[PDB]
Amino acid sequence: RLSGMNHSAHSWGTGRAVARIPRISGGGTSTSGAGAFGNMCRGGRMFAPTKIFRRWHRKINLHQKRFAVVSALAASSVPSLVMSRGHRIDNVPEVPLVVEDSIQGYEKTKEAMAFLKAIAAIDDVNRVNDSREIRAGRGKMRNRRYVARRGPMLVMPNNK
Amino acid sequence: VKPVVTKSVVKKRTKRFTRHRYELFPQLSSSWRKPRGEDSPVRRRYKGQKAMPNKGYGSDRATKYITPSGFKSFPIQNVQDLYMLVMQNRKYAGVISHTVGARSRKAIVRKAHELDVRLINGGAKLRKL
Amino acid sequence: THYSRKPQVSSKSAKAKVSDLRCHYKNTFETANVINGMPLRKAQQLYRQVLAKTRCIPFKRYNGKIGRTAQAKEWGQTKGRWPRKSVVAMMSLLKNAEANAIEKGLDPNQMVIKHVQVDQAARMRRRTYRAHGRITPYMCSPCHVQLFMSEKKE
Amino acid sequence: PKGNNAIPHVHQKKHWNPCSSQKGNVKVFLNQPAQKHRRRRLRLLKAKKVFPRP
Amino acid sequence: SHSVDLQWILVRQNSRFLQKRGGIRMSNDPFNNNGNWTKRHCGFLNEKAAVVKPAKGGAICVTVKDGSSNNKPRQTYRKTVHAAGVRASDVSRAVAAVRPDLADVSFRRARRMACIASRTAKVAAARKARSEKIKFSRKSVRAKRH
Amino acid sequence: SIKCGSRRKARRAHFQAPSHVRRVLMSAPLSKELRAKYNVRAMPVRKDDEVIVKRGAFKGREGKVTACYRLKWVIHIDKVNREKANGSTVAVGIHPSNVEITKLKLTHHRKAILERKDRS
RNA sequence: AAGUUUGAAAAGCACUUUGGAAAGAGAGUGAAAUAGAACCUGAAGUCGUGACAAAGACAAUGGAAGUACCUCCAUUUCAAC
RNA sequence: UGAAAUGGGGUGCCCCCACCCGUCUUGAAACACGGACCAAGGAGUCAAACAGACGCGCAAGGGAGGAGAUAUGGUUGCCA
RNA sequence: AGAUGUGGCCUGGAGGUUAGGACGAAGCUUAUGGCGUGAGCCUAAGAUGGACCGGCCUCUAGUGCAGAUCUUGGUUGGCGU
RNA sequence: AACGUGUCGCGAUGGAUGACUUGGCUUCCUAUUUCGUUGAAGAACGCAGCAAAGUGCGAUAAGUGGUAUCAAUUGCAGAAUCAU
Fold this sequence. Notes:
This is part of a larger assembly, with chains A, B, C, D, E and F. Chain B is low in regular secondary structure. Chain B contains one helix and two strands; from the N terminus they run ββα. Chain B has a two-stranded parallel sheet. Helix content of chain D is about 35%, strand content about 0%. Chain D has one helix and no strands. The longest helix of chain D has 19 residues, at about 30-50. The termini of chain D are far apart. In chain E, about 30% of the residues lie in helices and about 15% in strands. Chain E has a three-stranded antiparallel beta sheet. The chains are: A mainly alpha, B little secondary structure, C alpha+beta, D mainly alpha, E alpha+beta, F alpha+beta. The interface between B and E is medium-sized, with 18 and 21 residues. The structure holds four RNA strands. Chain A: Belongs to the universal ribosomal protein uL4 family. Chain C: Keywords: Ribonucleoprotein, Ribosomal protein. Chain C: InterPro entries: Ribosomal_uL22, Ribosomal_uL22_CS, Ribosomal_uL22_euk/arc, Ribosomal_uL22_sf. Chain C: Belongs to the universal ribosomal protein uL22 family.
């Protein structure tokens, strides 16, 4: 809240043959008499300083949240949408692909791979895997280095 | 692949629109901006001031967006994008993107010359055999 | 970098330059540019005569207010001037480009001067004290100088 | 004030915004869930120490 | 049951297959015949569709959807190769059995693939004919594997 | 100097890492013939180790590692060299992760490490 | 006020030569030295230099419409065409 | 197969047309005020109460808030 | 003056999707042309550069400059006065 | 003719843009977390083979002691010589 502010700056006024903005008070430094307290001044405030009390989080009707997930599943059962939504889905045996309950029994990861290759899902997880790049953007420097495409989520009833 | 011919290609106005009094100032860009000046001569249409853009300058909508070769220009980043315009190649032509490569640019020149789709910035020596 | 231009047949040529030479730009602009076509030996003659105030360095630009002179008639201008400080510098630079050409196996008596060029250089500042407690820049203005030579023969 | 709109009673006159000048009585709940996970973690730990007392 | 009418309002303005570039809307769908973005030409979307798609030399495949195995994908797209010298009205009349909407395009596309293959034959012959004269200082071969 | 998520704390804790951390951080892999014997994936480089460069422009050179310069994040080998302008040779430094440990010096606390690493 | 960010590595230009020196001309290192110390990229503005276009005083620019000379940017054509 | 040709571009010229921008103003080319050049900065935002349009859910019912409960009593994290 | 519309142009980022890049990314420069009434886009060349990045749907905002005796840095005619 | 103007090719002056980031801001959590007459916070001088600032340290002064670690530190010189 104090950024671009701490200064003794006042305005010289009219009659000094200079703009009327406030100016830093003192002497012997490079910034003596420079402008202060304004968004235009080099280093002044930002225009309307951002706050923490912005409205960050929106409510949603409890119902519409339910409607929306329900409505989002009916799109998971259509192979045409899924085609254009981007997943390969070429060799997938059937739209609500369904698998056994023993899938929870795997322990080594090498076996869960040949599973995905058996129901054909290894073609999509090679769309995610071959799409990993370093971002174009400033996001690299924020803690996000890599972009990946979104993959074939798998739904297991228990946490286990 | 001789293009689809249209009617006459006449443009209404070739000369560009440049903003008022940009030559005087080196920072002013030649791009247009509408003068809002109250006593500004250009806004008032003084005959010998520069002309403004209108709805009236349209390109005839028949020959609109057609390059001088007769091909509406469709951009292409990779050899797979040639297949879309294989069928309409009489109409559209491809434009290799800037960043596409000396190596990929080798491929698209081949797989265009085979399909007879036309590339603008594609090498023209295969055409002038 | 530098050397804005390139000699034709650089196998016969002598480059030379000085950079950030402390001397006035606007005076060295004038005393260098007089040479630009002159063979070496006659470009040095020109300078030893200027120091003797027989001939003069014509100022074609940077004339703003100057004394008229009768020695500027040979060059077509009325205005001229005799800048020893900047002549003595160009004396040593031409004497360098003669030492380059002589180590290249050339006879300097046939060397003709081509492409003399003078540019502004980073100028260094000093202050000045004025009425009513003011201070105003006293800055000076050094120059960059570069030239090359080439032979000439029948 | 202009138009048929309702007569605004918003009470904001007192200094609340923490303007570069002042501090200002603003309470923000951005820590709500982190204190939701904390009150639970501390009901469990006490349940783990109180054992087997209800 | 998610009619084509309803699915075309969903995928119209966003898609993997949309590919609108420089103001033009083409379609990168493999099942488009000519490549415009419209219902009659969306192969992935429609409940019955067909394509004229090439194969070796001049053979012309045709891939064909149908109502019934509509889900279950390796089973929903069925390709059948016509012989090399096939007439174009032959291929179109195949597509017109499934989807008579496409009877014109499949013809124009059948004649098109036939033009491409005999175009590749002239080119690839003339490139290698004058490729002999060039002495290459490198070439690469992927070694056969067992 | 552990990898974090934040990359600002990671690079910071990496380049402000003190000496001993810089000993671990710069560690070469050791040749298969020394992986067979000690059953260890890689070790931090010591002074006298004899070592082969796999990484670059010196690729295939073999030398004794004069000294480990931990401030420059670099190892100095024998027979990895360059001549200055004036004709003397100066040891060209190479980063350890680019290099391979063929023969490593042994001392009693360096052995207590190889016993302590054993995967078996 | 001020990134001291050269480069992968100082390999930070040995040496010859003109100079009182600063430096210049060579050479050498390096993929780049137009990366040579402020050293990555190196913009605008202003200035120099070769070439060239011309140009009377109507302050200059500006509109529209031609022509003169360039441009070699684009598209098109080249023979039962 | 080097050229020809049409278009675009550049520089000069001719006949003609043409007051200096932004602004306050009944009125600005004004002997009205701001104005040497450039680069980078530079001005309707955030929050709350009320209303009316328009999008959505539900409907004589609608909707929470705070908290609790577990998948999560887990996970560096993705999970605030 | 003012009101609104645009499948309307641009900018930093987040959710998606599709691509590019040491055979040369962003940036930069150009009598480089092409497209759009226009904001602008796109290709060509760099004897520029040295590692990132484009399109499209949606979200998002510290999002578009010529003017304030605007701020800061630089430069400049006056003036070799 | 000269000055001056204009276009291009290169060159200087100038330090923008992008790419780069151990900095900033803000939000959150953990805890046998709160200084001082047993001389604190702040102040001054000093200390290194070479030492201006800065960091560390106090006449035991760029550090002593103890444990853990396991061959450096490093611009230069110097230095027991590998089982601690």
